[PDB]
Amino acid sequence: QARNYKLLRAKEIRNTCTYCSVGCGLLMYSLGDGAKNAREAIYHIEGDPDHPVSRGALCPKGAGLLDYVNSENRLRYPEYRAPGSDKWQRISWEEAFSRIAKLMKADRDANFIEKNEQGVTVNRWLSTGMLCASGASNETGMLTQKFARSLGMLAVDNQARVXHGPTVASLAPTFGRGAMTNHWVDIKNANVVMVMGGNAAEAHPVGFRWAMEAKNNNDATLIVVDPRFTRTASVADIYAPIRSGTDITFLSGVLRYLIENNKINAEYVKHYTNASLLVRDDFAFEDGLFSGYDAEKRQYDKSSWNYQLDENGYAKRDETLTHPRCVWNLLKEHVSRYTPDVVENICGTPKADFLKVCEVLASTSAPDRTTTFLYALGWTQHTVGAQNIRTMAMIQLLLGNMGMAGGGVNALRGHSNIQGLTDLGLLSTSLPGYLTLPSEKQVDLQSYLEANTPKATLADQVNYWSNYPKFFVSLMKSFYGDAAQKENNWGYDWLPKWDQTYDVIKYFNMMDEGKVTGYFCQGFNPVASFPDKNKVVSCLSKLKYMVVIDPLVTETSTFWQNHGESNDVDPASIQTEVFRLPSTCFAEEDGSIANSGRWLQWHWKGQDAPGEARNDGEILAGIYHHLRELYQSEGGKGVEPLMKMSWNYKQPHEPQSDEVAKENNGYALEDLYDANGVLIAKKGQLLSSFAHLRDDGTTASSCWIYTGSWTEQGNQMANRDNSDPSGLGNTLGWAWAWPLNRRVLYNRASADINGKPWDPKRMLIQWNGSKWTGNDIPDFGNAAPGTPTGPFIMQPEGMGRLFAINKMAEGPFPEHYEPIETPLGTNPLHPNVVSNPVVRLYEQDALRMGKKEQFPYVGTTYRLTEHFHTWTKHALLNAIAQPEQFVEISETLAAAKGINNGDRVTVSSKRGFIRAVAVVTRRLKPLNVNGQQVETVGIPIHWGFEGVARKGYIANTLTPNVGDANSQTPEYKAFLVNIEKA
């Protein structure tokens, strides 16, 4: 008979996939029953059938996790690479901690900046920076935040900088928050699923099941708009090509089409958007530039990009929408230039295809039909990334799809916990809960709070950010405890104050000038992920010290090692001291991570890490305690802010996940009472809602939007009730979502002004005469139907913005601008303004930009379903699935170059080259653009010089070092290359 079932007596552990943001549930199996004498060893992993999002499924990455956990390249011991050396030397943990602490203290004492030139205390350290792990837990994230800021660091970023930064920069100004608005299962309720600016079937496969459910079982139309015919296109009803970097033209064309054909949800637009608000008379746009442009500083004076004010100081309105200055009429005028012919001429999209897309999207302007957009990097990684997203968000507002089940903007997050690290503020000028570090111009607490607490711009609005002081003081109480009091302004001056944003491109420009001494790379592989790899390696080579914390060997940890063409360096010429510290992976700790739908999910430990590997919190603690002890006995610069930071854990060298998660949730530090004299919480208890946070020092929380995640009722992130009473796919009992378990953001907009559902078959909330109740937690207060209170409660005007006032760097309305490296060498809409006029481009990088005469083809980089960045190539199962590096080109380009399918080729740019196998296919076709034939060369990003897949080249060897004008997110999706037979 068959072999016996191999898991019958194994230990079963629940955990979550460590790769993308879908957050699939896992059931891991270990050899051993937990007895102390048996050392657990995971030997099989499969899906959790009860998880509502994945329902047992796992894509090739999740399904192959065993080979990552047990990779031959797992790190085992602390290792050190000496200056000019070509080998690693194993050292003890104590040696690593002491050496690192000594290096850090010497650098901090030499370069710490206590006061700026204007005499303000700024307590900042800029000569050592850090990259944080979006693949690690929220608890690791908070410890990292405390570690970095208490030391005064401002060059602190996580993957968000090179990923969804543009989304936050655009969706927050448009809707009030930067997060994905709905959730995975909810996609099944859509009538139209739009995959543009993303490739969900390859980048979020298990989550994509719900788009297939919408298509197959809800009769939805699936549309894919991409320069390549992808695996998502394989199952699409409609496929339309588009040239990389032209989305704003295509989307603005859709806006023009909707307005011209009156295919909008008029009542939704009139009441829920700022369509009726009047704009200042001095606002204008002409020939590619908005009013207020300063050509020398290459920035805009945004004074004119604002509303006209009435006698009470609120925005003036014209409910009839006839006034020439209302947002609605100005929007109509702005997009009038984007005709179908213009779309075809710039995007290359045939008019017949564009028409099909317009018609289908237009069909969802009906109140009971919705479109949901699924996007990611195809839109974010451009110099106009934030504006790409602005245009789509505007479309969803015109169609009345925000706040609707089956609608919304599903900005699909990347790393398993990039959402959590963004929430916790591991970005240069951020603090947890979307709070902001003080700028150096804000000399006192009062000035700081006033700058961050917005005044309402229309009467009768929730304007919830008015509560900023309560969140800030509570954060300070969590950080400093008894040391933070009213008398010393809650420790205000201990936080580092910024003079500017220290984004990664800027910081590496500084590194190249010799201004950076050390760098930490915690679960981040910049040699593989940063743009212009040859320059990146050159920059890192100038560092005096580097500390890598990871569960795997990474290209960054071995940047000093010669790997032939893949990494042609001379170890003897690189003086950097490199420390490589072995950490745990997802399966070796308990903790929480936030998925794309804002679900904070708890997971449990399945085995101990291999060799001497330690968990991330232990590694930080080891370095931190060694460093603070040096300060205790030697003194030094910036002693007080460092020593005042709390590290209140039962075992200081081993902070536990539950301790940190509870800190994030928050506590009542004194008994708390409501206005009627009723006790809401007792001293020492966990808080149940951020509504209970106060600005008087009686409450603490290190992440206010997480209050409710772990209460006196227990760890809500561990909830496993998959009940869906409404049938809409909303499972309030599984895990816990922020804010306050609201699964669909902006849900008040799922109903009209009288509280009646736009679609009676999709009711999310309803009015019972005294409060809002329903199938989801209301993302609203208790304003009765008919009142002026808007549904976008984080907006000072309570509306979705069609006109983004003074929030965007390059304009209150999106506008087409070509990529820095463009195949046309001009912009057909306005030749006088070719690329984004507010883009920052350092002189050194401008010299490394190519032109179409030498690099005629559009280069773009993307993913394949089988691999996750340069991480999975360390796992055998995935290496077997896609073993060797390739690039994709059309049959037309291959024929012109004499390249046969499977032949070896050399793809190059102004910055470098890679060699690979050519995948010649009709899935890539040239487009007719502005009278030329434009070809695209596709470059997947999964291979490199470490791993078990066949050795290859870092794709970023080709990419330009320039980014979005708002977030400085690199333009990895549209540049120029050349190709030759190899």
Can residue 718 be called a binding residue for a second copy (CB under 8 A)?
A: no
Long-range contacts of 748-751 (CB under 8 A, 24+ apart): 748/403, 748/772, 748/778, 748/779, 748/780, 748/791, 748/793, 749/268, 749/272, 749/400, 749/402, 749/403, 749/404, 749/791, 749/792, 750/403, 750/404, 750/405, 751/785
Can residue 959 be called a binding residue for ligand MGD (CB under 6 A)?
A: yes
Can residue 654 be called a binding residue for a second copy (CB under 8 A)?
A: yes
What residues from 244 to 263 belong to the interface with ligand MGD (CB under 6 A)?
244-245, 247
What residues from 391 to 450 belong to the interface with ligand SF4 (CB under 6 A)?
none
Residue 378 beta carbon to Mo ion: minimum distance, rounded to whole angstroms: 12
Q: Binder to ligand MGD among 189, 252, 383, 529 (CB under 6 A)?
A: 529
Q: How many CA atoms lie within 13 A of 526 on its CB side?
A: 29
Can residue 726 be called a binding residue for a second copy (CB under 8 A)?
A: yes
- Residue 387 zone, left/alpha/beta (φ > 0; ψ -120 to 50; rest): alpha
Opening angle at CA 923, ends 917 and 925, nearest 5: 95
How crowded is residue 219: how many other Cβ atoms within 10 Å of its Cβ?
8
Alpha-carbon distance 153 to 540, whole Å? 18
Alpha-carbon distance 304 to 300, whole Å? 10
Residue with Cβ nearer a second copy (654 or 695): 654
Residue type, 516: V
Residue 61 beta carbon to ligand SF4: minimum distance, rounded to whole angstroms: 4
Residue with Cβ nearer Mo ion (163 or 385): 163
Number of H helices, E strands in the chain: 27, 42
Residue type, 659: E
Partner in contact with 24, chosen from a second copy, ligand SF4, ligand MGD, none, beta carbon below 5 to 8 Å by kind? ligand SF4
Provide the 3-class DSSP secondary structure of residue 338. Answer: coil
Alpha-carbon distance 78 to 444, whole Å? 43
Partner in contact with 138, chosen from ligand MGD, a second copy, ligand SF4, none, beta carbon below 5 to 8 Å by kind? none
Q: Binder to ligand MGD among 377, 764, 799, 838 (CB under 6 A)?
A: 377
Number of residues near a second copy (by CB under 8 A): 7
Residue with Cβ nearer ligand MGD (227 or 348): 227
Helix axes 247-260, 327-335, angle to 10 degrees: 120
Alpha-carbon distance 444 to 472, whole Å? 14
- CA-CA-CA-CA dihedral for 298, 299, 305, 306, to nearest 10: -160
Can residue 727 be called a binding residue for a second copy (CB under 8 A)?
A: yes
Can residue 594 be called a binding residue for ligand SF4 (CB under 6 A)?
A: no
Do 157 and 550 touch, CB atoms closer than 8 A? no
Number of residues near ligand SF4 (by CB under 6 A): 13
Site string for ligand MGD, 776-805 (x = CB under 6 A): ------------------------------
539 is known to lie in a ligand binding site: no
Site string for ligand MGD, 862-891 (x = CB under 6 A): xx-x-xxxxx--------------------
How crowded is residue 932: how many other Cβ atoms within 10 Å of its Cβ?
15
Can residue 906 be called a binding residue for a second copy (CB under 8 A)?
A: no
Residue 885 exposed, middle or buried by CB count within 10 Å (0-12, 13-18, 19+): buried
Alpha-carbon distance 571 to 352, whole Å? 57
Binding range to ligand SF4, per CB under 6 A, among 58-66, 265-273, 373-381, 544-552: 58-66
The footprint of Mo ion (CB under 5 A) covers: 163, 414
Residue with Cβ nearer Mo ion (414 or 655): 414
Residue 36 beta carbon to a second copy: minimum distance, rounded to whole angstroms: 11
Which residues on adjacent β-strands are paired with residue 980? 906
Binding range to ligand MGD, per CB under 6 A, among 518-526, 822-830, 913-921, 943-951: 518-526
- CA-CA-CA-CA dihedral for 62, 67, 68, 69, to nearest 10: 100
Can residue 62 be called a binding residue for ligand SF4 (CB under 6 A)?
A: yes
Give the distance, in angstroms, between the CA of residue 335 and the centroid of all CA atoms in the same chain: 29
Looking only at Cα atoms, what is the longest distance across the chain? 87
Number of residues near ligand MGD (by CB under 6 A): 63
List of E strands, 460-604: 518-522, 545-550, 577-582, 591-594, 599-603
Give the distance, in angstroms, between the CA of residue 25 and the centroid of all CA atoms in the same chain: 21
Give kind and range of the element (H or E) at residue 27. Answer: strand 25-31
Can residue 725 be called a binding residue for a second copy (CB under 8 A)?
A: yes
Site string for ligand MGD, 222-241 (x = CB under 6 A): ---xxxx-x-----------
20 is known to lie in a ligand binding site: yes
Residue with Cβ nearer Mo ion (364 or 417): 417
Residue 401 beta carbon to ligand SF4: minimum distance, rounded to whole angstroms: 25
Alpha-carbon distance 333 to 256, whole Å? 9
Do 62 and 70 touch, CB atoms closer than 8 A? no
Can residue 603 be called a binding residue for ligand MGD (CB under 6 A)?
A: no
Partner in contact with 62, chosen from ligand MGD, ligand SF4, Mo ion, none, beta carbon below 5 to 8 Å by kind? ligand SF4
Partner in contact with 725, chosen from Mo ion, a second copy, ligand SF4, none, beta carbon below 5 to 8 Å by kind? a second copy
What is the secondary structure of 223-236 as a DSSP string? EEE-SS--HHHHT-
Residue with Cβ nearer Mo ion (750 or 959): 959
Site string for ligand SF4, 4-23 (x = CB under 6 A): -------------x-xx-xx
Q: Phi and psi for 442 in degrees, rounded to 5? A: -90, 90
What residues from 181 to 210 belong to the interface with ligand SF4 (CB under 6 A)?
204-206
Residue 243 beta carbon to ligand MGD: minimum distance, rounded to whole angstroms: 7
397-to-164, 317, 637, 819 alpha-carbon distances in Å: 21, 18, 52, 27
Partner in contact with 303, chosen from ligand SF4, a second copy, Mo ion, none, beta carbon below 5 to 8 Å by kind? none
Closest CA to 804 of 196, 372, 283, 449: 283
Residue with Cβ nearer Mo ion (376 or 705): 376
24 is known to lie in a ligand binding site: yes
Can residue 79 be called a binding residue for ligand MGD (CB under 6 A)?
A: no
Opening angle at CA 175, ends 791 and 689, nearest 5: 65
Can residue 409 be called a binding residue for ligand MGD (CB under 6 A)?
A: no
Alpha-carbon distance 482 to 949, whole Å? 54
| CA-based radius of gyration for the chain | 27
Residue with Cβ nearer ligand MGD (300 or 560): 560
Binding range to a second copy, per CB under 8 A, among 110-118, 232-240, 508-516, 649-657: 649-657
Alpha-carbon distance 282 to 445, whole Å? 35
Can residue 24 be called a binding residue for ligand SF4 (CB under 6 A)?
A: yes
Residue 96 beta carbon to a second copy: minimum distance, rounded to whole angstroms: 22
Residue with Cβ nearer ligand MGD (376 or 456): 376
218: which DSSP letter? S
Q: Binder to ligand MGD among 493, 616, 818, 935 (CB under 6 A)?
A: 616
Binding range to ligand MGD, per CB under 6 A, among 580-588, 620-628, 718-726, 848-856: 580-588
- Is the previous residue joined to 785 through a cis bond, with omega within 30 degrees of 0? no
User: Residues marked as binding?
Assistant: 17, 20, 24, 59, 163
- Which residues form the interface with ligand MGD (CB under 6 A)? 18, 20, 133, 135-136, 159, 162-163, 196-199, 202-204, 225-228, 230, 242, 244-245, 247, 376-378, 381, 414-415, 522-525, 528-529, 549-552, 554, 583-586, 616, 860-863, 865, 867-871, 941, 955-956, 959, 972-974
In the complex, which residues of this chain contact a second copy (CB under 8 A)?
650-651, 654, 656, 725-727
Q: Which residues bind ligand SF4 (CB under 6 A)?
A: 17, 19-20, 22-24, 58-59, 61-62, 204-206
Residues comprising the binding site for [4Fe-4S] cluster?
Answer: 17, 20, 24, 59
